[PDB]
Ligand binder design. Structure first.
Ligand SMILES: CC1=C(O)/C(=C\N=C(/C)C(=O)O)C(COP(=O)(O)O)=CN1
Ligand SMILES: CC1=C(O)/C(=C\N=C(/C)C(=O)O)C(COP(=O)(O)O)=CN1
Ligand SMILES: CC1=C(O)/C(=C\N=C(/C)C(=O)O)C(COP(=O)(O)O)=CN1
Ligand SMILES: CC1=C(O)/C(=C\N=C(/C)C(=O)O)C(COP(=O)(O)O)=CN1
Ligand SMILES: [K+]
Ligand SMILES: [K+]
Ligand SMILES: [K+]
Ligand SMILES: [K+]
Lengths: 455, 456, 456, 455
């Protein structure tokens, strides 16, 4: 049901343990915007699972063995061998993290005016597509947009929407299909092997390329192992390798499922594209053999990807997130369902139904959570959606959420209990949560530095 | 309140795994049914000891990169020295590689052949160093410390009536010193009260008798005082620690326990002449007074760790994590030493195995069976550890025949505790399957470390 | 005086070794005669670049254990931020993963298509980011910087007459900014004087033109100012650095050079609106303004390293070690760029190989031959690096056709320098054996990194 | 002649660089006793080569992999395998450093009244022999006592003295022969393979055991490679293994030739002695599988011993010391000859022949060296010999020396030049060096804390 950690603690990170009254002052000093809190003031930091993971003793040994050569580092060759074996692409180019790989892919693979279709999108990924002249098309199944619908493989592409696009626009006018595993925007929802194969088969008949956004591909493979018929005798490694067999390449943020603090990479099978990629990596990142990483980080990521293949590790990772979601759900706390691989999203609209979206319930709930528990969470609602700059109106998103994002191997079920118990107690007196109003709003990136006060 | 979450985050991890029961069976036999003789790789959760098995912090690992390895004058020595002077309040410090190295120095320096050393229950290496330097050991702990099931507070306390009697019957000049350990390891990690430390100092001082503390789990002990002794609820852990040592003439310390390191110890004293003599001796056994058989980076880690240990939330969690395991075991009717102590839960082997005699080594055997059935390693703390009476040659016979589930600091979670509890509860369902043991190889001293047995 | 000993001790080592000439020959062919394409394992002493190849200190490694990996609000970000604010004197900082990431931001933010960017000699990635954002590059370095053998001080200085002419012929509003690099890498690591920085600021300020520094080797540059510019002999390295940047509106920095790290860079500016815009852009390419595509531990290492770099003895030794190699080479009549610069000795390939034309790529070829004969890796810094004229499609033709023996900071000793000098002197004895090269594979930009050749 | 370092620098240790005037104050604050200087005030620290070595990147990787189990650590098994392969003993017991191993050996191998004979002695080694009731007998060749005699293998035992001892005392009355490699007291002098075999053969015929003090056995093996006929096609590893084939066991300080900062061990071939050793290690050190070391240090020492077998490494180590001695000798500076493996010893008696031994020329020369260069060196003369406590007279040693002891892989030839140039300049005006007199003298260990002032 919930397994014990399949690891023990080698070293600890010291935290302050400041009490509620002091947390309230820190929160006020941050203008009630959790993005403005200092890391040294936070007990449990669930802002993101990106780059916040705990490394192993074996990775730290690798950290001492950084061959820092500008070209031809042994660590690059270790990374390259590892990704070829595990993902099964012919070619790999390291990048400092995922968005560096996305910049490269989109410049290489898009002609202005072409469509890129995907199972929803991530903000950086879609931006790089659009900056290169692509029009984005959502081809996710309709269910993915229903946040209360508890169904499996909610990240699946709708083959009919793909077909429709090909019929209406023409294959030559589609740059590529961008299939993300898992689907972050839908709450971390997995994609099935059947769907990946069906997309490979249809695109292949039309000469259309498919590139994966692989950042949480290991969480994805765990869902396939757990829930997809016929994958129960298959190892995580076998699943991961089969998944990528249905792609022409990928962009990877190692900062997620490769269990590192920095690192990413671009893969492809096509020799000519690989050649062009090497011509471009040097402009933005570094050499084809470091790509904006220290040798020690290529080493840490090579070791971390291989650790991520262990079944017990990934089972525990996903079930720890599930434990938090299960406990919240059992107390009647409204969440996005089903719980995804990396986070639990509170539905702040329903949590704070005495407040209007214009009063920023997700922002305000995230502040309350920090004050009551020392937990930092991310606003993923009206604030982070930003303001229409043509009209000056808020972009008003359907999802008004607080993201409890879980770094890998950092926290225990007891820290999950701190988070849950705190949220449950807040829920019991939810009507007491107050609305927020801007007191400082920057013109851009407002979620990063906006300051608020209570209404 | 009852069970707080870890007051830290995980910075790095070590993988854990379990070999099949069939393989464990083979390994237990190959180790001659002594858990000390199993290999680390063959252990799933290793509760052999809290000694040297602690997880260090990121700050201690940063100190590890700043090892100043000079033979004399290292910054890491000065940092250790001023930290221990500040926190414990003794005048002088001599580092040693670990606690038994400091006990070697103390016993050689402070005992004349034929004298008595009186202590709140024996300890294994401690008693051996006393006895090998010609002392007779006298246990002056309260009787109640030897009754496993008796739930009373401050079980580690010295019985003043027994101390008084020793002085009367033997004369103060024939007592080398009082050895006061905090907490008391073999009583189950049981604390000593401040009132008792103060009373002991007062009695011994009037008679000119020296008192040397075994400081190895003094922070755990300070936690119990803050939690349970009336008047201390408001004092900081650090204030408690400093007051505790104000009632002593010096101490031995294994830093491998409450200083949160993997190696390290020291000897403290207030007396200038003893300091001089201790330095002459340290060079023979350990190294120059300026490193004491430690790398500079380990002095640094030990200085940093001892100060980390003073954080209330850290030590509250440390002790309550142990308590949680004991609570779950108790709830299922598993017999344990009570109350639960600072560093371990001690299964009561006499009750766990009523069908065996103490001469059939129930504790040694239970530890074997726990490993075979669960892949958890635990330690014998009974008749084998007690050693032999150095006059009659018979086994010492402790009332406490226990198996120790010892918890390294900052290493495991409550989920690991639940795994351990579950496996022990299961084994209890068939306790009568645990077989008697007999010696096949017996070392001449500290026999428990490497002795080998076979089933009767 | 002339050649000081290392002002540090060795804390840890990496082994070095040499594969036979026969094996090196094979490897050079397999790398298509481009030194960039050899493997690290196959190199004995690796002088390809001083970029990212530096040895960190014990203090920086201690900072590496204290990485605060938070996505926003990391202590390591705050430490970097206040360090750069203190030492460089700019209002705002945006970290980037390395220097070309900061050049991406600057060029996008500060250039309107069709504008001119004027600089003290081009640099490779710098010129590409200017040109790809629609700028025309204009070289305003003094003519003497392009003559390898001419031994004059402060060769990096901007020719004010050329700057003045640019403003006259093109109009100030059509100049996006002046790019002033310290030191000037491709001139041979040549410094810029304070007087010149002050004069440039004065001229540009009167016309409303912005000046952005390439800060990557500013500490080396400050060393030359202290050593050679009248009036500065008494100022600290840190004072020199802070004054230098007071003449700028912001900078790009590759921390991989003078900040003594293996990864890292940043963009600084004084202007609030530019800061806002830079943050919008950083999120697209690098990461959140609060880490900029760097682990927290690398921000920390870069903060610590930049402050280490201000120690006079450290930078005096850094530069004199380079000078020693150049001195030994000169003494034996080997043709080099003079005076020797801050980070490398640059062999003059035109003189080393008089028998070849620049169209036959003497520098690329010499670098190949050095590796084959010595197992030392060096870099082409000539016509291949210069790239193509983005209007005519012809090779840019630099007067400076050089091969760079680039010295990573705190990595090698004088004995390694002597090994390098000895091997190069030997190769010089048969310079006429070095054969012309021709392209077999040419990338569309920054071609030198991965191009492959074959002998004519 | 002098090779370049067969390594490059991975990381540096920061030092203060304080100037001459400030060094003079530090020296005065230390009462002119270099033992009292703070490490943070010293540029180049030549006090000892014990435990001061620079580790490699590979050792630091091993430092991150410490299996800290109290019993059965993987690191112990790695150490054990390595020592068995390289030294060729059947059994190994780890100890925290060399004197811990000596305590164990002497308790195991000596009955009160027995003789232990050796090629000179080391202070801790001889003390442990004597505390256990042994009488020490020097059986080194007479030449070893002539400090100006430049001959090879000066550490050799005189077989005739050994024979004489057996004849006069009886084999049953000799506990063992303690053969040290190299011989520290004679200036770091090596012992020949011929001598080790001859001693093995004579002792074997009489049933007498031989235990090596192996602390600088790798320096020793380098001398055999370099100078002993017939060892020129032999690897350092082959030499080391043959050396120990002539012993019944050894005590080792890894802090010397195993390239670590802490660590040591005891080896033996005899099963019964191994059993007894395991019974004793637990009293003083720890378990047979950690012996008073952290698991990470058993790992560092296992990796370091194997690194020490590399020919280029040990050739450079010994020749760097030689470089310093050669340069001093060429300027006419009086030194113990020939230069040993680990240090250069200045003859302070001849250096300061205007001073009497009672004026402490070695102590005073060591102070001058620090003041002029920031180099710390060790007094090895009348001060470190101590005072006769029966009579109160100085012990007056024949050797009045300053030891310039070189840690492995820490310094370069340039640092050797700082040391040499400074000493040479002092030598040029040697008559200016002033005598010292006590102002504070402890009753014991006076070299550690005595304070002086100028006469
Ligand atoms: C699905 C997906 C992501 O979730 C993603 C980054 N995620 C962040 C920063 C997060 O907080 O979820 C990126 C960008 O990776 P990067 O943050 O540049 O290494 C790409 N795809
Ligand atoms: C109270 C006390 C101890 O518990 C102790 C060692 N304890 C061990 C090894 C244990 O497992 O409890 C020692 C010896 O310390 P040492 O293991 O040598 O650092 C002294 N006193
Ligand atoms: C003056 C200057 C440089 O020298 C520079 C990079 N130099 C390299 C790679 C070199 O080998 O010189 C860069 C680019 O920095 P980067 O290599 O991207 O961190 C900018 N300016
Ligand atoms: C020949 C020899 C030595 O040189 C030695 C220690 N030497 C020191 C401390 C030195 O400064 O030379 C020891 C003692 O090793 P230890 O310092 O306890 O690891 C034994 N034999
Ligand atoms: K990070
Ligand atoms: K690097
Ligand atoms: K040391
Ligand atoms: K340990």
């Amino acid at each position: 049901n919930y397994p014990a950690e399949p690891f023990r603690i080698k070293s600890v990170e010291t935290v302050s343990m400041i009490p509620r009254d002091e947390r309230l002052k820190k929160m006020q000093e941050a203008g009630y915007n959790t993005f403005l809190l200092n890391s040294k003031d936070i007990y449990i930091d669930l802002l993101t699972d990106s780059g916040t993971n705990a490394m192993s003793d074996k990775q730290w040994a690798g950290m001492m063995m950084g061959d820092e050569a500008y070209a031809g580092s042994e660590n690059f060759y270790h990374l390259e061998r590892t990704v070829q074996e595990l993902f099964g692409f012919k070619h790999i180019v390291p990048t400092h993290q995922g968005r560096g790989a996305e910049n490269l892919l989109s410049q290489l693979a898009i002609k202005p005016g072409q469509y890129v279709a995907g199972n929803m999108y991530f903000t950086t990924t879609r931006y790089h597509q659009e900056k290169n002249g692509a029009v984005f098309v959502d081809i996710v199944r309709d269910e993915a947009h229903d946040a209360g619908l508890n169904i499996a493989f909610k990240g699946d592409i709708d083959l009919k929407k793909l077909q429709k696009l090909i019929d209406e626009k023409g294959a030559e006018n589609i740059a590529y299909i961008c299939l993300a595993v898992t689907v972050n925007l839908a709450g971390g929802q997995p994609v099935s092997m059947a769907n990946m194969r069906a997309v490979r088969e249809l695109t292949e008949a039309h000469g259309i390329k498919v590139f994966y956004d692989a950042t949480r591909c290991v969480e994805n493979a765990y869902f396939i192992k757990e829930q997809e018929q016929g994958f129960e005798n298959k190892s995580i490694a076998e699943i991961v390798h089969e998944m990528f067999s249905y792609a022409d390449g990928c962009t990877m943020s190692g900062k997620k499922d490769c269990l590192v603090n920095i690192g990413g990479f671009l893969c492809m099978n096509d020799d000519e594209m690989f050649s062009s990629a090497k011509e471009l990596v040097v402009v933005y990142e570094g050499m084809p053999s470091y790509g904006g990483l220290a040798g020690r980080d290529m080493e840490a990521m090579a070791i971390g990807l291989r650790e991520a293949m262990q079944y017990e590790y990934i089972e525990h990772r996903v079930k720890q997130v599930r434990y938090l979601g299960d406990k919240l759900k059992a107390a009647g706390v409204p969440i996005v369902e089903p719980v995804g691989g990396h986070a639990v999203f509170l539905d702040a609209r329903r949590f704070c139904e005495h407040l209007t979206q214009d009063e920023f319930p997700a922002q305000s709930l995230a502040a309350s959570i920090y004050v009551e528990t020392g937990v930092r969470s991310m606003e993923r609602g009206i604030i982070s959606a930003g303001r229409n700059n043509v009209t000056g109106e808020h972009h008003r998103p359907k999802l008004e959420t607080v993201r409890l994002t879980i770094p890998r191997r950092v926290y225990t079920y007891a820290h999950m209990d701190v988070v849950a118990d705190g949220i449950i107690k807040l829920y019991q007196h939810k009507e007491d949560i107050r609305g927020l109003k801007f007191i400082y709003e920057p013109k851009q990136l407002r979620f990063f530095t906006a300051r608020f006060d209570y209404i």
